[PDB]
Amino acid sequence: KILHRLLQD
Amino acid sequence: KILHRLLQD
Amino acid sequence: SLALSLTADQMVSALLDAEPPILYSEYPFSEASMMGLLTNLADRELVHMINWAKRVPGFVDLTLHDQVHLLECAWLEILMIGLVWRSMEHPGKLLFAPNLLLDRNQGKCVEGMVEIFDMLLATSSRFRMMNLQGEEFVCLKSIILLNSGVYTFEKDHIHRVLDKITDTLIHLMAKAGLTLQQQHQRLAQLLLILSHIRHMSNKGMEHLYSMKCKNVVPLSDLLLEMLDAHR
Amino acid sequence: LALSLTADQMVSALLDAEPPILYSEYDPTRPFSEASMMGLLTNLADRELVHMINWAKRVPGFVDLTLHDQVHLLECAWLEILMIGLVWRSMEHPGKLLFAPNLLLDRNQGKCVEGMVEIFDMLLATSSRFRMMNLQGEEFVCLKSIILLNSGVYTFLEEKDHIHRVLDKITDTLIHLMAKAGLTLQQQHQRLAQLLLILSHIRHMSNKGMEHLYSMKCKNPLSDLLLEMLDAHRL
Ligand SMILES: O=S1(=O)C=C(c2ccc(O)cc2Cl)C(c2ccc(O)cc2Cl)=C1
Ligand SMILES: O=S1(=O)C=C(c2ccc(O)cc2Cl)C(c2ccc(O)cc2Cl)=C1
């Protein structure tokens, strides 16, 4: 889940 | 077509 | 025109007396049988909606081609907000007809309906939580009729009529003792629901086109005409 | 947290968090192939998504949410947000869509992609509407943030109340702006309604656009992140 990671940075 | 008749009455 | 000369109360009364009647369904369920009852009911409800539209203040001022356009774009939204309205005093249930009260489990009989079902149920729960009133409801329904297709395919008139309904919506809220801040906040809350209602309709439109292609049940020629407009 | 903001602070926060206008790698020496034009549009949207995600994190109240929920709201609104951004950029360009400063298209060029011209016209009609309303940037950033928080609430508890609280704050902000332009209450409510009804059309464009992209998927480009957002609305 890419969106997951980008939101988590 | 059908919608025309129902509106014209 | 004449819809602009109307006062707020006259606008409300006009919309209330224009309200279509609640129809009954025919007669466990299968996919074919449930689709049969729902198709029949929707087809008959459509006839009454078209009648109702002609009683919406300002709608007759439009011309035939434009009336057709608005109705073609908004028909499922109007059916859906009507369904959602009837189901308000029946939490967790959708009142398609008085003799046809269904839940989400029964919506699984038809493949791919349970999703739209849950959205419909969610809208009813939203209406109930906001304590939506009949006068507010009939305003929203006419707004849908005029707004939904106004951007596609004269326009100044509709926008002025739309402004009139906004004035009518605010006037209703001012009577209920709602403050200034509470008024425009509720107004916003109500109109934002139209966005999800639009979403349900587009999702619903997909569901019916596939049922047409699946040929599981023959649909009404009127229903097929309205469904082909969204293509 | 975000409930404590005043209207002017709400606007400033939203304005300061605005994403940049990215550039397309568009070479004016390759007059259109459907694969290339789609490639240009896909590359741009994918880079715009990255900025949107970091933009969303700066929307007052969004951070106060949990994951799952931030993911959900973005999975629902991403195309609406890209579209209202595209429309807003195109306001001073009648009959044209400014995808990038170097990529300005009309409905004729939109016909290069099968069935894209329909969505084009809808995007253009939206832009014409905003220009007609003379939409303001302060109003734009409110609308865009309204889209982020509203498009997904109806498809999820106790979190909705916080969202509606933030949504009510943005509503107050819009009214605050309109009152500052010497509008009158009547026109304030009227404009507020007019703006919020546009969102319904924006939802409709997004839904249609969503179908269109799922179509180009099983036709064979598309970024990984874009396909991930696309499976959120399934097919
Ligand atoms: O769950 S849903 O989205 C709701 C409907 C619906 C049905 C009847 C109504 O009177 C009102 C509605 Cl809103 C349908 C539907 C089903 C079969 C059809 O041939 C047509 C429709 Cl409109 C599917
Ligand atoms: O004409 S449309 O509706 C607009 C877009 C679009 C493109 C770039 C943006 O930066 C913003 C948008 Cl809104 C696309 C589109 C095209 C190809 C894609 O892979 C994805 C999209 Cl979103 C189709």
Descriptive overview:
With 9 residues, chain A is an all-alpha fold. Helix content of chain A is 78%, strand content 0%. Chain A is built from one helix and no strands. Chain A is elongated, with a radius of gyration of 5 Å. The termini of chain A are far apart. Chain C has one domain (1-231): Retinoid X Receptor (Orthogonal Bundle), CATH 1.10.565. In chain C, strands 1-2 form a two-stranded antiparallel ribbon. Chain C starts with 7 loop residues before the first helix and ends with a helix. Helices cover 65% and strands 3% of the residues of chain C. Chain C has 231 residues and is mostly helical. The radius of gyration of chain C is 18 Å and the shape is globular. The A-D interface holds A 1-4, 6-8 and D 50, 53-54, 56-57, 67, 70-71, 74-75, 224-225, 228-229. One ligand 5G2 is lined by residues 35, 38-39, 41-42, 45, 76, 79-80, 83, 96, 113, 116-117, 204, 208, 219, 223 of chain C. Chains A, B: It is found in: Nucleus.
What's the alpha carbon Rg of chain A, rounded to whole Å? 5 Å
Order of helices and strands of chain C: HHHEEHHHHH
**What's the β-strand tally of chain C?**
2
**Number of continuous helical runs of chain A:** 1
Most extensive protein-chain contact, per-chain counts: C-D, 37 and 36 residues
CATH topology of chain C, anyone? Retinoid X Receptor
Number of strands of chain A: 0
CATH hierarchy, class of chain C: Mainly Alpha
What class, by secondary structure content of chain A? mainly alpha
Structural class assignment of chain C? mainly alpha
> CATH superfamily of chain C, please?
Retinoid X Receptor
In percent terms, what proportion of residues of chain C is strand? Answer: under 5%
- Number of structural domains of chain C: 1
Please state the second-level CATH architecture of chain C. Orthogonal Bundle
Q: Which oligomeric form is depicted?
A: heterotetramer
- Beta content of chain A: under 5%
- End-to-end separation of chain A in angstroms reads 13 Å
Region (Self-association) (chain D): 1-235
Family (chain D): Belongs to the nuclear hormone receptor family. NR3 subfamily.
Modified residues (Phosphotyrosine) (chain D): 223
Lipidation (S-palmitoyl cysteine) (chain D): 142
